[PDB]
Design a protein around this nucleic acid. Structure first.
Lengths: 109, 113
RNA sequence: AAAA
């Protein structure tokens, strides 16, 4: 059983269909405790944010993950649709975080 | 029960937790038949994707980059790219057609809770 | 929110 970290969920993470995905929202403390795991976070500002929140030392690792049944995924998620192609800067993602728009999830396949 | 069309599935589409979704893969024909319907709520948020699906399906969608929020028993059809792209990539029509012809544009049906 |  593997555990992954990502900056979004994508259907491209799934390998077999149909599949059921169970999604729960968790708080910062639970997120940080559980990710302190295979990192796929693919944006620099997100790495900086989670390292600051959790005291971790992840580095950007923009790779494809493929989940199997009973794999688990932690997501740090932006709770707003952004402009096309948006890559958030540190200032931008911190502003979103401080406005309640960066949220944390646990996903079981 | 509402039906939506999108260019991805995102956790930001969900409103209540914990929740389940079930995701299944469908082919182009099934996708086109199910979205060529008057009830569907379009959220496709890139121009090339609109042009691609209109060409594949004979539809007349326009770009509508909005937030959808799914409730229990809602259904979602997704057209998406089957590969992780460079950061911030917005595919052109030529690019997305090439991906489509190489098997890298895939179609999904999602049932929420 | 085509893998924020």
């Amino acid at each position: 059983n593997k555990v992954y970290l990502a900056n979004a969920f994508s259907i491209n993470m799934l390998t077999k269909f149909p599949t059921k995905v169970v999604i729960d929202k968790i708080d910062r403390l639970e997120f940080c405790e559980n990710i302190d795991i295979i990192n796929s976070i693919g944006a620099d500002s997100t790495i900086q944010l989670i390292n600051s929140l959790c005291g971790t030392t992840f580095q950007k690792n923009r790779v494809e993950i493929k989940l199997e049944k009973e794999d688990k995924l932690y997501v740090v998620q932006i709770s707003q649709r952004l402009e096309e192609g948006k890559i958030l800067t540190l200032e931008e993602i911190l502003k979103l975080y401080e406005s309640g728009k960066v949220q944390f999830f646990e996903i079981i396949v």
